[PDB]
Amino acid sequence: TCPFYKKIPGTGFTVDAFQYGVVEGCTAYFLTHFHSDHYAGLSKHFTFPVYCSEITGNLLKNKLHVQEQYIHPLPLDTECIVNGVKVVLLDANHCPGAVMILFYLPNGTVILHTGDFRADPSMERSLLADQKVHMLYLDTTYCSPEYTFPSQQEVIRFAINTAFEAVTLNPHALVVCGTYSIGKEKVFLAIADVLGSKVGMSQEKYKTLQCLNIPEINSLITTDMCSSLVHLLPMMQINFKGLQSHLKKCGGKYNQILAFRPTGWTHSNKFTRIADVIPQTKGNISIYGIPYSEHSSYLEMKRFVQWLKPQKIIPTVNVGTWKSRSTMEKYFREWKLEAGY
Numbered sequence: 543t544c545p546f547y548k549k550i551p552g553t554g555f556t557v558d559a560f561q562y563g564v565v566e567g568c569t570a571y572f573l574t575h576f577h578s579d580h581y582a583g584l585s586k587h588f589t590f591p592v593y594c595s596e597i598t599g600n601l602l603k604n605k606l607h608v609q610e611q612y613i614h615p616l617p618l619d620t621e622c623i624v625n626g627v628k629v630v631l632l633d634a635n636h637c638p639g640a641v642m643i644l645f646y647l648p649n650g651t652v653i654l655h656t657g658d659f660r661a662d663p664s665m666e667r668s669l670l671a672d673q674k675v676h677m678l679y680l681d682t683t684y685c686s687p688e689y690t691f692p693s694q695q696e697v698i699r700f701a702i703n704t705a706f707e708a709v710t711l712n713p714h715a716l717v718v719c720g721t722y723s724i725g726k727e728k729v730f731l732a733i734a735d736v737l738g739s740k741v742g743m744s745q746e747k748y749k750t751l752q753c754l755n756i757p758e759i760n761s762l763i764t765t766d767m768c769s770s771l772v773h774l775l776p777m778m779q780i781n782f783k784g785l786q787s788h789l790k791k792c793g794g795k796y797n798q799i800l801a802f803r804p805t806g807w808t809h810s811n812k813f814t815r816i817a818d819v820i821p822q823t824k825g826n827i828s829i830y831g832i833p834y835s836e837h838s839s840y841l842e843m844k845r846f847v848q849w850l851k852p853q854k855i856i857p858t859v860n861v862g863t864w865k866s867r868s869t870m871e872k873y874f875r876e877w878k879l880e881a882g883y
């Protein structure tokens with residue numbers, strides 16, 4: 543049964559609630575983004591209206607075969623009426639097509655559902671600037687002060703400089719980047735751009751990327767692995783056994799692999815700067831774990847919430863344990879006492 547934190551009171555609406563069968567009283571199902579824990583349950587047999595971004599709707603039609611007549615894509619930054627209720631979709635700074643949803647309830651309550659997001663000061667000048675928010679349904683993935691990581695720009699600078707140096711020293715080195723979902727495309731695209739190569743990948747992953755409205759994509763990716771020196775593999779294959787096997791398949795074109803695993807946070811973050819990151823090496827294979835996050839750090843989250851000043855916070859992540867829930871509630875109270883709302 544659908545948990546309360548997926549339900550929007552005073553409406554017929556749910557958010558990211560496709561794995562519970564027919565939810566009683568739901569007239570419209572919203573989908574914030576195309577990640578499996580959020581879309582779980584959708585397929586070509588779904589017959590209720592799904593509301594989402596254009597990019598999410600391209601993925602639903604092409605990857606899950608949801609029929610067109612049930613997909614209702616909305617433009618961003620635009621007031622729309624859904625089943626009698628004003629809504630707006632805002633960029634979430636998460637993966638491609640990911641949105642936050644503003645609901646303007648018929649009684650005057652305003653609700654922000656962040657979906658998954660990486661808070662940014664640029665959000666302080668969106669349509670959120672223009673009215674009060676009563677209730678915040680918050681992505682609390684990294685809601686504890688241990689969770690620090692660098693900017694996405696510092697991480698991509700590290701990656702590009704590392705790859706360019708390795709391949710210039712050895713023109714017979716292959717670069718490999720792990721993936722298992724959409725998101726984090728800048729990692730492999732930025733490295734291929736500095737090397738003058740396309741990114742090579744499987745037909746299934748090329749199909750996914752073709753749904754994303756990324757400019758000039760036909761110029762940047764390919765299914766012809768032999769023409770590319772940046773390859774994309776499943777995240778599960780980014781280990782010494784998996785990479786040794788891949789190197790066999792390339793027929794002596796290459797004699798070294800440099801591989802990247804774009805994790806979120808790992809506790810090497812509590813001690814080490816990005817500048818100081820080193821790989822795990824075995825023979826002619828090196829693997830870098832890089833802290834490229836598409837979720838808020840603790841400090842980014844705290845700044846957003848202290849700016850927004852919501853009357854009530856509903857966490858959407860880490861809700862399954864009493865210790866996690868009590869930790870998050872203590873931080874919310876600190877934030878509110880420090881800022882004065």
Ligand code: NI
Nearest residue numbers: 575577636658
């Ligand atoms: Ni996500």
